[PDB]
Design a protein around this ligand. Structure first.
Ligand SMILES: CN(CCOc1ccc(C[C@@H]2SC(=O)NC2=O)cc1)c1ccccn1
Ligand SMILES: CC1=C(/C=C/C(C)=C\C=C\C(C)=C\C(=O)O)C(C)(C)CCC1
Ligand SMILES: [Zn+2]
Ligand SMILES: [Zn+2]
Ligand SMILES: [Zn+2]
Ligand SMILES: [Zn+2]
Lengths: 302, 9, 354, 10
DNA sequence: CTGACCTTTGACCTAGTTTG
DNA sequence: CAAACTAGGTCAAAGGTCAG
């Protein structure tokens, strides 16, 4: 009838938007369904013709994209059980506490060159804290490192920015120093420091952030499924949804007068990340710049 | 190395 | 505006004594016009628009429970449609459509409408153009110089091809903001602040609507640029778009409709955690009520999406995540290049941003 | 400060 | 893994039913 | 009867499978 716009072979009609041969139609499908990633061994120039089209997949799929084949034109496996849930109830009545809030709570109860002293000293603490947070230890010892590497930064900040409740216009490093505001501007890090006071310390402060609620948030910042490397992201993404659940309920119990508290608690997260990124910025600027005043645990962390 | 150690145990 | 008793999408009428869609209609008739037996399935599958074509036993079984009968067929007209013309739920509309909840859905509708008149290309349009189910011409794909050359330093033509867009979007977002219950009443200084920081987050959210794993719709949606193409540009501009694509892949999994995007967007413009705000209590006030409105929009649109509201608010930290990371690259450019003819509107917004 | 214009003109 | 070849879906249109 | 609807049929386009 027609000619396949991808390889030249005879096209058996239309498939996903273009005139494709039955072969190419199957290639596109499998690629999209099993979500595969191909790489070219030449210069992304490999020629596609009925003879040598299996010569290189990357090039072939791109020939597809270009000739107009649409990915969303593909439906998914008309043969799934699509239910990772166990019959009836997986923890009778949800248990709500598959991620017990008490455990976290307990786990929580367990100028510049001065800051980093706290950091290092505090970085050995994190393994302790995380170690105590349920389901973390049952995770692959690799993902544990990935999880803690990608989040030590944020976890550490959200810890002291709470510890600095009261103590206005200043903050207490984990060891004992009361680094006060004006004491930073001199060092040149007055911009960042102030942001911590105004969108963390402050906000956190006027909210009466329950020492629990904090730990519940640090858990969410820990169980970050997006971290690159997790041999399995689905599991991590889950343990976070569990914690969304626990904390979510924990406000229905403790703060019934505040329906929109759960959300207000989760919105402390965006700022915790900008501030967190801007800080790394001020570390890869104090390290490669040979000022090297840090210790040892800050070497693999960077 | 460090993170791996503290985690090792 | 009726739905299907079996899967969900709008029904095409009364087929075999029940409101069914064209798909479920013909599935039922095909199972009968041909003695068809689908081996049991103990699991009580949830029949929805998508899942509908998975477990055949579970689909047929269900539609027999909804009443579909070969002996319930009915031709003609609707003599007493007037009876069931009150969407047979106007009694739960005096119960559910209220009290301090009838307003929430009233706020949503308002925004969904303000959103539709503010932006030309909604996620709806974009998904047709993308799923190809439309009466249009397939977007002109652009996977290299050859195709690009057919538009009517290259890395830059494209880069500034974006900066140009933003400006247009910014003007659009702006009017959308000026229709959010109480945004004008705020102190002009925070009205401006809320936008200096808003637009960006607003953009990537919108921008992700016209994106799939492979590319992105451009120029009104009549053009499509391959991800592979962009990924391969002049040394600094290669990575420029990956983060946006990564984010878009994640954001899309949530499957939000324009209705849900329309409220989420308002929630971003109204965030009392922005630097330089004076009257924070006012702002936060609008937000709180907007969040309370979005939470209900999601429960009623995605009854079975576990923790969707929570997950959606998490994407909000990934937005900042991008934006600040974008600014870093935009910073780098100022060095490894000398022609920064970045538009003067982008200048305001961009300069001083954290 | 250019935005002031779009917020004040409808 | 490919892709020849075989089964379903379901959007759209026709021919006949029922209400006013 | 005209107008307001449907059961069926039809055919392109999706889905599957399983030697090679
Ligand atoms: C890649 N596309 C799709 C749109 O993709 C966009 C990506 C990023 C932005 C953010 C802008 S760009 C900047 O420097 N600052 C900003 O706020 C805006 C749009 C192109 C490319 C060329 C022509 C038209 N469309
Ligand atoms: C916040 C901040 C900074 C970054 C430090 C980092 C990455 C971690 C600190 C952890 C602490 C202080 C932990 C604790 O003891 O609780 C810098 C140096 C740029 C200057 C002042 C503001
Ligand atoms: Zn072909
Ligand atoms: Zn190749
Ligand atoms: Zn249906
Ligand atoms: Zn089933």
């Amino acid at each position: 009838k027609h000619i396949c716009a991808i390889c030249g072979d005879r096209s058996s009609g239309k498939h996903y938007g273009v005139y494709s041969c039955e072969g190419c139609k199957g290639f596109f499908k499998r690629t999209v369904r099993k979500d595969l990633t191909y790489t070219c061994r030449d210069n992304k120039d490999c020629l596609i013709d009925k003879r040598q089209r299996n010569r290189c997949q990357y090039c072939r799929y791109q020939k597809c994209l270009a000739m107009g084949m649409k990915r969303e034109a593909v439906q998914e496996e008309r043969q799934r059980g699509k239910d990772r849930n166990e019959n009836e109830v997986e923890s009778t009545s949800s248990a709500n506490e598959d991620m017990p809030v008490e455990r976290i709570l307990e786990a929580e109860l367990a100028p510049v060159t001065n800051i980093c002293q706290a950091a290092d000293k505090q970085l050995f603490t994190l393994v302790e804290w995380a170690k105590r947070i349920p389901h973390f230890s049952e995770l692959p010892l690799d993902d544990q490192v990935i999880l803690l590497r990608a989040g030590w930064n944020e976890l550490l900040i959200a810890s002291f920015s709470h510890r600095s409740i009261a103590v206005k216009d200043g903050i207490l490093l984990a060891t004992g120093l009361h680094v006060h505001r004006n004491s930073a501007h001199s060092a040149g890090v007055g911009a960042i420091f102030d942001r911590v006071l105004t969108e963390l310390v402050s906000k956190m402060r006027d909210m009466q952030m329950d020492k629990t609620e904090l730990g519940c948030l640090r858990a969410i910042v820990l169980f970050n499924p997006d971290s690159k490397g997790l041999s399995n992201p689905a599991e991590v993404e889950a343990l976070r949804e569990k914690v969304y659940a626990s904390l979510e309920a924990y406000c229905k119990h403790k703060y019934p007068e505040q329906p929109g508290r759960f959300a207000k608690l989760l919105l402390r997260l965006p700022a915790l990340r900008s501030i967190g990124l801007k800080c790394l910025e001020h570390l890869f600027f104090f390290k490669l710049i040979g000022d090297t005043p840090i210790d040892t645990f800050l070497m693999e962390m960077l | 190395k460090i993170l791996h150690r503290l985690l090792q145990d | 505006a009726i739905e299907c008793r079996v899967c969900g999408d709008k029904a095409s009428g009364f087929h075999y004594g029940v409101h069914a869609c064209e798909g479920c209609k013909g599935f039922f008739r095909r199972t009968i016009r041909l003695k068809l037996i689908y081996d049991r399935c103990d699991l009580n599958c949830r029949i929805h628009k998508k899942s509908r074509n998975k477990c055949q036993y579970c689909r047929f079984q269900k539609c027999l429970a909804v009443g579909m009968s070969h002996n319930a067929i009915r031709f003609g007209r609707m003599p007493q449609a007037e009876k069931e013309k009150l969407l047979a739920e106007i009694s739960s509309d005096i119960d559910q459509l209220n009290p301090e909840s009838a307003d929430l859905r009233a706020l949503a509708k308002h925004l969904y409408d303000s959103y539709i008149k503010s932006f030309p290309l909604t996620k709806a349009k974009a998904r047709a153009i993308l799923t190809g189910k439309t009466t249009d011409k397939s977007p002109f794909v652009i996977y290299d110089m050859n195709s690009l050359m057919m538009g009517e330093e290259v890395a830059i033509r494209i880069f500034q091809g974006c900066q140009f867009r933003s400006v247009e979007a910014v003007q659009e977002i702006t009017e959308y903001a000026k229709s959010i219950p109480g945004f004008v009443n705020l102190d002009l200084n925070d009205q401006v602040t809320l936008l200096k920081y808003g637009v960006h987050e607003i953009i990537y959210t919108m921008l992700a609507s016209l994106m799939n794993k492979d590319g992105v719709l451009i120029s009104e949606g009549q053009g499509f640029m391959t991800r592979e193409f962009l990924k391969s540009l002049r040394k600094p501009f290669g990575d420029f778009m990956e983060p946006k694509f990564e984010f878009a892949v994640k954001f899309n999994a949530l499957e939000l409709d324009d209705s849900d995007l329309a409220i989420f967007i308002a929630v971003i413009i109204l965030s009392g955690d922005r630097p330089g705000l004076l009257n924070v209590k006012p702002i936060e006030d609008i937000q709180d009520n907007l969040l309370q409105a979005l939470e209900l929009q999601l429960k009623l649109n995605h009854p079975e999406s576990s923790q969707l509201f929570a997950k959606l608010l998490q994407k909000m930290t990934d937005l900042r995540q991008i934006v600040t990371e974008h600014v870093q690259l935009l910073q780098v450019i100022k060095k490894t290049e000398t022609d920064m003819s970045l538009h003067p509107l982008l200048q305001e917004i961009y300069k001083d941003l954290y």
